[PDB]
Write a protein that binds this ligand. Sequence first.
Ligand SMILES: C[N+]1(C)CCC[C@H]1C(=O)O
Length: 264
Amino acid sequence: SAAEQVNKTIIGIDPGSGIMSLTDKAMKDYDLNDWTLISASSAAMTATLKKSYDRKKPIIITGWTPHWMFSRYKLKYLDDPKQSYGSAEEIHTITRKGFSKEQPNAAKLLSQFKWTQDEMGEIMIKVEEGEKPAKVAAEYVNKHKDQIAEWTKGVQKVKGDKINLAYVAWDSEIASTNVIGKVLEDLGYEVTLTQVEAGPMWTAIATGSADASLSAWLPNTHKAYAAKYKGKYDDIGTSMTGVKMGLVVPQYMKNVNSIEDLKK
Ligand SMILES: C[N+]1(C)CCC[C@H]1C(=O)O
């Protein structure tokens, strides 16, 4: 059984994260209160995944779709019939209150930013290969010529205007923040990227100390953070849809398909 196979253990990421709260709810929804959820981090969990995959050792992680892990590995979602992880998750483009009128040109670009999951992986994979994000961003924009035209449609050039982009250091958001960062730099902007945790990121935006962020995962991941700063930020675009999250096992675990299978 799945309980037999993993010793009632889920390998997760960092404790302060959205997927970890959501998992807490999951374990509670499916009556898994004798299970152990290991907190770790992205780096640590993906390493533990690597060990177990190679050995064909059964493992249950907390996975999220917009990530290179589904590329480097044959993985799968355990079905969530109780939808503990919510649904219709999206990546959003947020700014500080009154950025759109302070800088109409920069907001135009930010609101027009869209791309797909594998287009983001185009970047994420090269970065995990050890390529420098700023180089991969440049390579990307000088490759996907038509996509940038979409984004920069009716967008003027500026004389060294300053812009502060706040990002949370998940691999997905290193992808997006750099690509957009580069687009702005090609446009003649003085671009700063400020790294922060989620929370400090939301605060920075809500208190004007950062201009924009491409790290808002709504509505499920940052339910609380979005609520907390309800009338104090701008949501000016969706940069991606169909992002999924939950319990992920490798495909070799044929007999484990639902979270329900853990009750056995
Ligand atoms: C799903 N994630 C791992 C990726 C971005 C948000 C983060 C989380 O808080 O769960």
